[model samples]
Target: PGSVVELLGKSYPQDDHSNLTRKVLTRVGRNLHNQQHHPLWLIKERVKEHFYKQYVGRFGTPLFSVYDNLSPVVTTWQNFDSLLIPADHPSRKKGDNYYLNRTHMLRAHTSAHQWDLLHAGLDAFLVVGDVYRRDQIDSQHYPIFHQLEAVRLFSKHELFAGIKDGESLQLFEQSSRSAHKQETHTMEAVKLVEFDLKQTLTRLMAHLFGDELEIRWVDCYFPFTHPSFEMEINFHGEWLEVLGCGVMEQQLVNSAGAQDRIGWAFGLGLERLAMILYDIPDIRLFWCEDERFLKQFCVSNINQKVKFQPLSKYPAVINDISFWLPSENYAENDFYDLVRTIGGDLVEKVDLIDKFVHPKTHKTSHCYRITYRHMERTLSQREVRHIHQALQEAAVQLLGVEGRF
Candidate 1:
């Protein structure tokens, strides 16, 4: 089956690593963030407005260029290498991504376009796009999600505009263990950029949920940015991550032809933020076409605090699948993707309940318990059983696993 594949009206040669599926490919055009009344879109515009108002260009206009219309299809270079991700990084694995072939795949994060935008001479910009991943099923997990990537580049002149000894400060520094910033960044400049990033996002959270919201920053790491930090907001006594950001790695800036400049970049998941801000309980609800869900928010309500009312506490059906693996290297993400492909939004969660070796056959067998739940309406037992049966057969054919029962 590894020969050639077609996507977005083009064909590509598939290799041993090809893992894209028709179900995941179908998720490409559902640009809910592009829809005007969508929660994702509303929040996107709100963020754009904040930047537009705070940072004006030379002509007193918005400084950040928005690229929400870009295609989700990206070359492997743009998705991984351009951001300095190692070739052996786990994020590049077939089980973790939707690959079109060996050389192309769906963008897993909005940061995939960072190189292109910088190469195009964009110093400040925003990229809003749909990203794909093969993840386990849960209330908060989905294979497709929307992300907003914000990048701002500052020149040495702008970075040290008014600091003490600012005129003598350098943007680049030598590598040292004591240095808090990256080898290419001066501690002075990095501190300023970090402060700017945190302040900007803190004000953004206040803008979204008012000034009383509790917030904190946690140290984190990402391949593309050094000394990274994740921002979290407290909601109902639980702290939830809202965004990830840090100073841009100098190598990436130089490679993109943006030398002699230093700045910060941040990525925010629209669904995650909107869920916490709007009280959206289920990640799958964002894709729901039901009018009752879609009609809850609009452009006018962008500034208001809105809680998504649960339509109903629908019941869930359970099904289990037991099978013997054909080999010792089967990836669980592959199995989860297969389940998601067949069950679609009806499947809630899949858990591994049993694993053992048959003494007589000396074969390894596994069992998974799948919970099927509908967000808007009740699912009849007959229909769920049909889907469950289809999943079992598909698993056998697609994943090379023999059903136990």
Candidate 2:
């Protein structure tokens, strides 16, 4: 019955245990890799194009490259072990993740492809894609979002090589990049590479944030990078962590057969940048197809910080759904996923308004107030009931426990 979704231009086969809803699948072909009109794609293109050119402008051709078309479904190994995530990381649990089955799931980050690229022997590249996470839903959070992966490698000489054509690359002065250090590579070599890394990121920030932006770097840790750092910029008096990067962890370069090589890699959330640049008040707007929202931004005119026109604020309809835990392992995200799958953004908020223990049964009971609202218009009671009915029926199958009525 769904005719390729009027706006996103894609179709999905019927779904099952994968947890991918028709609502999410509707995003499939909106691929920014080439869909020029989508503002989402525009932001992605500008990043890829700008950085590709930025790198080429300095590093010369062969054009580095960008990969935005990788499939979202991937083995847990690629999403976890290949990136050095510990087996016990909380992010791997069902509460924080979407599992298609025991062994496969949606890629949680664009970094999921890092090991692949490293193996494919690409010394420098960018990967961009839709990533999934079971997150607290609200104006700023969504289970599915976009991220970009950037990786660069250097051989022994490349780190010390000339600025270009053997002209001699300069050193990072004592003050500009003092935080960078190394445990494995030659301190001198790491210093030079770190200088280039910071400079590369600094230029990226400068082009995107302009002179007035106050930025800082903080020491940090990540599964795949060592001597890692996080970049934050002050926006409207609040500082937001914009990206995390570092000299590549030695092991990754080792697995790539580039053990003797030095490198750096980073992953950044594109929506974070887009939200600030577009002055978007809500993240969901990125997926909105209403002509009014869709018409405001486009490929050519994107990246301008324009205030978003607020859609009519519709009154919300609230309903309550109560159930008991199937067991202690019951994941709330599974329940929230059900709510979104049925209602999409129409289901505005799901708050656990009540929780108590059934003293006799010795189990926990929870009651949530699910508020349904639309940004553009009021929803009919019939529609709300229809959506809730799906929740009532499916909640039992997908989440609820020993006795749910």
Candidate 3:
């Protein structure tokens, strides 16, 4: 077997597979050893394995495989209609992406492969590949990274069947109820599938990380998927982003010659998972070739020992406080921040239960329902009074607000 080597701006064959296995193994060992202490490496490995196992358990083996097949050789610039991407999409610009030429560029995501697969009668497929971007590299960022994308097609009848019968409607209604009750709900079968996905991912983290894993959903924009969602996982008492996912748009399917098909896809960063799982403070550790630092991770199961504490046995006492504040001076976010700073863990929730625009003072009369509890002891009236006074003083200083009866 001949060895492939890039030299003098071109690839040439040197030998053959004589030392290929050894060289590849050496590279793997070097990379792993270099990243042993890095949390991101561990997280990547764990999440990759977890997702692989999950997919296999649910959907069976992957239908296809992909890899980085980059070449330095020049090729013709051929314009192809990017079905899902809008004409004005910033990513389409050569300045934002790696452009080999006017019409050809390094694909920005695994999704670029989707149209081809669908056109070939491959209704369902998964593509795990490395993508390139033009961006400044940092401890947490790189110009090149890994992405996993999947697409599954359904006929018009299948789509209608999947959505009809009021099942999805019930799930959506149930999800709303769950949100109202502050309970976890199933994400896959619901009409608002994004919420269900968030709920599912959160539950997975809670089961793997702990019950303290807080999950939140926020509106986000993605060109490929409509009604997209950005899911955040609360780890170590702080928010860490996980992935982007959404239901695929119909136009994209139509362009791929599967107009009647409906599907969904998600994009995830492997490095982010590594950071969350390994608890590494810095992401650069993965790239730094330090054997000593990496050696500590040899046969290490660092995340296995992780655990979250349980909720307190004491029942939280809810107090509704109606206060008047100068509308121009006080904002809700600032006041909430002050409360969280002073109350710490004792404050379970601070909600704007009600609000009124006072005619007399021309101030906003905000009614907040504050929930308080301590694991160590039940709070007394005097202690509560002291806390209320401190919170009031902090608010007053921060926003020129006053607490009312």
Candidate 4:
């Protein structure tokens, strides 16, 4: 005797739906679960622990509010005028996001809830939930994953209160610098304030992982956040990207009916963070159901700390070189590789300082600046010159280029 069940409208043998349900469940777990007991899951747990201790538990609730599609809404075309996304925006494109039909989508990011939350007159809220995109399934990608988003409204006084005297004016300048040269901008005091927030997030991870960690911000991009940044943690000598954040765009605020409010929000892959914290190399381990990997992690120990090395005190030397090459034949990356091959460990950085293509000569003049550094000893002018010359010779032989003054 076989069991029977009804699904949709028809009745089928119980085993048929059970098998189908298992297949569907597996697909959903594989696709929807951001942290699969893989390294990504471990890292995500660490991040969640970090967020709970650092931001969530301290400022608000450990379990912040979230919404799924079933959440009801009442709107006519005119009533929804406040939340208008540009038709040409990448998020609106079918290629970038999964559109249920034309007007509706799977909600690419949790920020979509901003307008509704604002319209309801909410002050501060956090949403941790899955979003959908038209992404190809792979080791690093899935159609559905999670995002941690927040919305806050602050008065001008509150917004400028923490900034040092006159530093408020520098926000735009800092924002510009962050966009063009993030590494330099991040070290600035204004940037450090933002950096500190990220550090706080890492501190939570440290408390959980029981390891000293370093958190840094990298300039990033998202249509919703004008000044977006990504958070990275130093783990076992490698920097792993964890999450992204930035001040919410003004247009988003206007749509939310909080035109004067200024706030910041961040979103990250739960699995990626788990992978980093747990030192899991492959993301697939989370779904393996293997007892060996599962035995290594205790849920309570998820917040153990790991140590990271401090910055070195050694001074660095910088060297600059310029050259001219055929406009059509030369590539900056190839030139950089040539210099690296010639300079080896002595070369710390290589940059193309300038380039000019001559219409008459059909040639390009490229200026390259190279930096050399050694902690134990200073490289002599002679040694530096020899390496520079060797680099020039390599470029000349490889690309048939002439050295520029």
Candidate 5:
């Protein structure tokens, strides 16, 4: 698989350029626990299906298709222009986006598909995928993250019923007043939809966290949603942001040929929520290939909660690998892939320690420290050497680099 393989249904040859050409769909195909047997995949499937099913239980008819199949490959227009993101917006900068030439790119969020989903006459739907971002490394941060995006539209009558706010009065106030800072909506209509949005999330957290889970909301902003906001829940003692959502702009509704409706949409970080719900602490742990982490979770976890008990920590074999940068165009994703393929669950992190350019050759060299070990068991020095050796060789073969062991 390392030498040559299919990624996201596309054939990729073994070469230094594979990293630059490798897209988000490739990542989803390779890294996501999308397989039914994987814990994170099971979590994603449940969260997706459960959200759709319960909506039916409450409203009589299912609102969304709960799609996990939309492609992450999208054109720039579908990603930015259709969502109303300004052409000059700083998010369109080179460092923030992975451009697939001048016209196409990897989607930065599940929301990238929103314009198309709405355009297709879908009143409501959920989209899930592997999202990409170039960022610093940490226990919580990773280049590739998972996200769940859901949107729902409202008919005027539903808004009027919700405005009545008789039994759901409290839900109506969760985000309505905050949104009040913008254009006035049917006061009751806005409140009703906002309440419905918050209420569903509350029940979801309860289903995943606990019945008594302390939940709250804070105002936030996004390009597509007006009076946008985010969601937070009290976990242990600290509060953490789990999702972002807001009322859909009237303009978007009108463009979708549903000028008579109003609704709310949300995009959330799935790995963060899974970590919070299941007591997972390290983002890299989600990539674990061994039963040490995978065995602790099961498919039944969909209907019930599984609070994974943390085991004793194992020692890490810390060391550095130095290589001459093959060219200025080399990408970090390729480096990340090499580490993941060879190191597997044992590679905790790969962080760059130093970089410098050579005056004579006009080439650069990078030194990175790779942290190696299991989550729960110790690896012998000899075994660790073999894994480390394989990683170095793959780097030279796939990244076009020189030097260092």
Candidate 6:
């Protein structure tokens, strides 16, 4: 470990836990979300416009403050502990995150800023930024993605206003066995806020998709919110999960110095929505430097619901490599990260096609199918072979595996 590591114009002490790679570090300054005419930037602007029209603040300004330029680097306390994620949570593992050191990391979620903003006296806000995670390689999964988080708090008067004879409703209550609401929240308050949250998100979906689109809500859970849920929309007759939302946990709001505020918070991935809306086939295309991908999307065409047309067809090069694991110490994500880091956007997907154990040795063996294809053009046979061989050599040297192919 070195004494210092500089990232995005800031420096920090490097420690034993630092695991960021050159490829990942270089993305810190891309700021694709801020790039004009990009699909992500277009989607972000649309969302901001929708919120501006939907909510109004004092003096006729937008109620929500948009923070699109926040730095990705954050402390463990701000990213996890402040959000009430437990110490032993699996998401904190170095395998699932890009750590600058033991105490710092690229934010895995935009919720990392919830505590800070709330404590600073903001009752309504939106945070948009690039988040990093160690994930599988697929058309839908990427090491980096963009997220938009919205939080709005309400007062007692604002929640119960214009409702007749509702003075008996209280904000807090004793613990209950019912699973749909939290202990510290009254049934009335939860119902009002839940309806508001669902309606707002539904309209947002309509704004992105269409009003005729079919959508449903499924119950779920999150660390910072109780009675959590996920919204799914019917696309091509198949259900596609969209976003997560719920009432903010009383403890979280209390901890954020908002003792008297109660509200709803929701976060959605901008890429996911953009892919569905624009009919983009690969997640890697969003990061593609090709102007053809960027020029296809515009503010006007998005409203027209025009599908993205690839300039030319690119063929995929498929390769398989099998190896005997030294032990069960091998994690599939490590292999995924290796291929992604080495292959970059060229490696579209890595699938574990076969896995078995030797009869006498009782040692595990794994085989993966790696699909290599450039988003903008074709890959030559010689080029694909070189990358494949490099991956094999790196696996033996970095992953401590006995290669079979």
TM-score of each: 0.95, 0.82, 0.50, 0.50, 0.74, 0.93
Q: lDDT score, residue 331, model 4?
A: 49
Best by TM-score: 1
Q: Each candidate: how many clashes?
A: 0, 0, 8, 21, 2, 0
lDDT of 2 by residue, 34-97 (tens): 5556656766766766676775687532245788888887788989888889989877876676
Tens digits of per-residue lDDT, candidate 1, 1-405, equal 558887778888988778888788787788889998889998898898788777663342228889998889899999999999999999998888988887888999999999999998888899998999888889889999999999989888787877777889878877662325787677888888888888878877887778898989999888888879999889878999988998888889999999989878999989999888888889999988888988887536566655677688689999899999887658889899888889999998999989998899877898999999999989999999999999999989988898995
- Pairs that collide in candidate 5 are 171-195, 220-229
Query: After superposing candidate 4, which stretches have Cα over 4 Å from the reference?
Result: 1-85, 160-205, 208-211, 234-239, 295-405
Off by over 4 Å in 6: 1-4, 56-62, 299-307, 327-329, 359-362
Better of 1 and 6 by lDDT: 1
- The lDDT values for all models are 0.86, 0.73, 0.52, 0.53, 0.71, 0.85
Higher-TM-score candidate of 2 and 3? 2
Query: Which structure is stronger by lDDT: 1 or 5?
Result: 1
Whichever of 3 and 5 has more TM-score, that candidate is 5
TM-score-based ranking, best first? 1, 6, 2, 5, 4, 3
Locate the minimum summed-lDDT window of 10 residues in model 4. Answer: 70-79
Which of the two candidates, 4 or 6, achieves a greater lDDT against the reference?
A: 6
Candidate achieving higher TM-score, 2 or 4: 2
Candidate 5 Cα deviation (angstroms), residue 139: 2.9
Best-fitting candidate, scored by lDDT? 1
Candidate 3 off by > 4 Å = 1-83, 120-125, 152-196, 203-211, 235-238, 296-405
Off by over 4 Å in 5: 1-26, 30-33, 60-62, 162-181, 184-188, 299-301, 319-347, 350-370, 376-405
Error of 6 at 133 (Å): 0.9
lDDT tens digits, residues 1-405, model 5?
245545356644444222233433346556374666565676677776666668767763346776676666667787787778898997776555655545556677888887777878888888878777655445687667788888888666555553454435321222333445335355656666777788777776776666877778998777788668788878879899999998877666677677667788888888889888777878877765667678777645466556587666778898789989786657665677567557766777778989888899988889988888677689788888899888788789878988744
Error of 4 at 202 (Å): 4.4
